[PDB]
Write an enzyme that holds these catalytic residues in place. Structure first.
Site, short mmCIF file in Angstrom:
data_model
loop_
_atom_site.label_atom_id
_atom_site.label_comp_id
_atom_site.label_asym_id
_atom_site.label_seq_id
_atom_site.Cartn_x
_atom_site.Cartn_y
_atom_site.Cartn_z
N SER A 194 0.80 -1.22 0.00
CA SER A 194 0.00 0.00 0.00
C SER A 194 0.84 1.27 0.00
O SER A 194 0.26 2.36 -0.08
CB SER A 194 -0.94 0.03 1.20
OG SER A 194 -1.93 -0.99 1.10
N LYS A 244 0.18 3.85 -2.72
CA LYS A 244 -0.94 4.79 -2.70
C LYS A 244 -0.48 6.24 -2.68
O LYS A 244 -1.23 7.13 -3.11
CB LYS A 244 -1.85 4.50 -1.49
CG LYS A 244 -2.60 3.17 -1.59
CD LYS A 244 -3.40 2.85 -0.33
CE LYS A 244 -4.40 1.72 -0.59
NZ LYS A 244 -4.32 0.63 0.41
N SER A 281 -5.69 3.52 4.30
CA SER A 281 -5.25 2.50 3.35
C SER A 281 -6.45 1.74 2.77
O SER A 281 -6.40 0.52 2.57
CB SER A 281 -4.24 1.54 3.98
OG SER A 281 -3.32 1.05 3.00
N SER A 326 1.23 -3.44 3.96
CA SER A 326 1.34 -4.79 4.46
C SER A 326 0.85 -5.73 3.37
O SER A 326 0.04 -5.34 2.53
CB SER A 326 0.51 -4.99 5.74
OG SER A 326 -0.80 -4.49 5.53
C1 LIG Z 1 -1.67 -2.26 1.56
O1 LIG Z 1 -0.61 -2.64 1.94
C2 LIG Z 1 -2.96 -3.04 1.94
N1 LIG Z 1 -2.67 -4.41 2.35
C3 LIG Z 1 -3.51 -5.42 2.04
O2 LIG Z 1 -4.42 -5.30 1.22
C4 LIG Z 1 -3.31 -6.67 2.82
N2 LIG Z 1 -3.47 -6.75 4.09
O3 LIG Z 1 -3.26 -8.05 4.61
C5 LIG Z 1 -2.78 -8.07 5.97
C6 LIG Z 1 -1.45 -8.80 5.97
C7 LIG Z 1 -2.65 -6.69 6.59
C8 LIG Z 1 -3.82 -8.86 6.76
O4 LIG Z 1 -4.36 -8.42 7.76
O5 LIG Z 1 -4.07 -10.05 6.26
C9 LIG Z 1 -2.97 -7.88 2.03
C10 LIG Z 1 -2.17 -8.93 2.36
S1 LIG Z 1 -2.09 -10.06 1.06
C11 LIG Z 1 -3.17 -9.03 0.15
N3 LIG Z 1 -3.55 -9.36 -1.09
N4 LIG Z 1 -3.54 -7.94 0.77
C12 LIG Z 1 -3.62 -2.12 3.03
N5 LIG Z 1 -2.59 -1.63 3.92
C13 LIG Z 1 -2.46 -1.95 5.14
C14 LIG Z 1 -1.38 -1.13 5.77
O6 LIG Z 1 -0.62 -1.75 6.64
O7 LIG Z 1 -1.21 0.04 5.46
C15 LIG Z 1 -3.22 -2.87 5.94
C16 LIG Z 1 -3.18 -2.95 7.27
C17 LIG Z 1 -4.09 -3.80 5.12
S2 LIG Z 1 -5.04 -2.97 3.83
#
Ligand SMILES: *C(=O)[C@@H](NC(=O)/C(=N/OC(C)(C)C(=O)O)c1csc(N)n1)[C@@H]1N=C(C(=O)O)C(=C)CS1
Length: 261
Positions: A43, A46, A103, A210
């Site tokens: 992310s 973004k 995010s 993440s």
């Molecule tokens: C950007 O990084 C976004 N990340 C995601 O979409 C995912 N979140 O998954 C995690 C590991 C946070 C979970 O809880 O399972 C992800 C993992 S694999 C996938 N296709 N998408 C957003 N950014 C964050 C951030 O840290 O800024 C999030 C907390 C999740 S949404």
């Protein structure tokens, strides 16, 4: 130097792969750790999409105020703001804020669409001199973070330079630059990452990421007391697909930097 050895020790203790780029704008010194290796951005991409829409708004006066319909087909995994407006509208300013400060992945996808797709985000990166950034997929797919996959990656060195240009340099007009910085300073997702390794009296604007393989990222502009601003990029990824997030590793990297330079 002592900082790079502490970062190497941090990486060893982590079991993952750590990438760090610090720019100290007091004298434009740069400290890199795996600074030219590619990492999945997740992310943190973004920021480039929000900045690209801000750039568009420099010549389309009222662009940020335009309403954008949120349709059922737009909803993805994680959309804590956009889901509250399904079958309604949000402005591009609201989508930018939701993308950067929460995010929200639906919000990001509306920005990508506004730019003509992932290639339009990348084209803006090229326009401001970032030849390394590449965005290849929409928000759901871009976080898969498979090792060896170059899609949706950049290097720490490139992202620090770009973040500097967008927030402290001249890549955007003055009103747009201030708006980007305002949004980053209001991020809600970063307390456990870079911010947690810094004195609380220092001002931070940041964007976290993440993803799969325990990928845990943070990119930040920092305004310490008593010295010029810093730009800090901390990327981290792990060998197991379902590895847990390590925001504490990012905080330790920030602490090494904050104490050592
Ligand atoms: C950007 O990084 C976004 N990340 C995601 O979409 C995912 N979140 O998954 C995690 C590991 C946070 C979970 O809880 O399972 C992800 C993992 S694999 C996938 N296709 N998408 C957003 N950014 C964050 C951030 O840290 O800024 C999030 C907390 C999740 S949404």
């Amino acid at each position: 130097s002592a900082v790079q050895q502490k970062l190497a020790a941090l990486e060893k203790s982590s079991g993952g792969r750590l990438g760090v780029a610090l720019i100290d704008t007091a004298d434009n010194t740069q400290v890199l750790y795996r600074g030219d290796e590619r990492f999945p951005m997740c992310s943190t991409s973004k920021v480039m999409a929000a900045a690209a829409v801000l750039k568009q708004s420099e010549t389309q006066k009222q662009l940020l105020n335009q309403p954008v319909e949120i349709k059922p087909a737009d909803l993805v995994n994680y959309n804590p703001i956009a889901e509250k407006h399904v079958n309604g509208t949000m402005t591009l300013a609201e989508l930018s804020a939701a993308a950067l400060q929460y995010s929200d992945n639906t919000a990001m996808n509306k920005l990508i669409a506004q730019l003509g797709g992932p290639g339009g985000v990348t084209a803006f990166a090229r326009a401001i001199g970032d030849e390394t950034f590449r965005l290849d997929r929409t928000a759901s797919t871009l976080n898969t973070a498979i090792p060896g996959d170059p899609r949706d990656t950049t290097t720490p060195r490139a992202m620090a330079q770009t973040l500097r240009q967008l927030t402290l340099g001249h890549a955007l007009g003055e009103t747009q630059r201030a708006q980007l910085v305002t949004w980053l300073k209001g991020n809600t997702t970063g307390a456990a990452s870079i911010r947690a390794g810094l004195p609380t009296s220092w001002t931070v604007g940041d964007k976290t990421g993440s993803g799969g393989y325990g990928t845990t990222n943070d990119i930040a502009v920092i305004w310490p007391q008593g010295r010029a601003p810093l730009v800090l990029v901390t990327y981290f990824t792990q060998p197991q697909q379902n590895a847990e997030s390590r925001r504490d590793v990012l905080a330790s990297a920030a602490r090494i930097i904050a104490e050592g330079l």
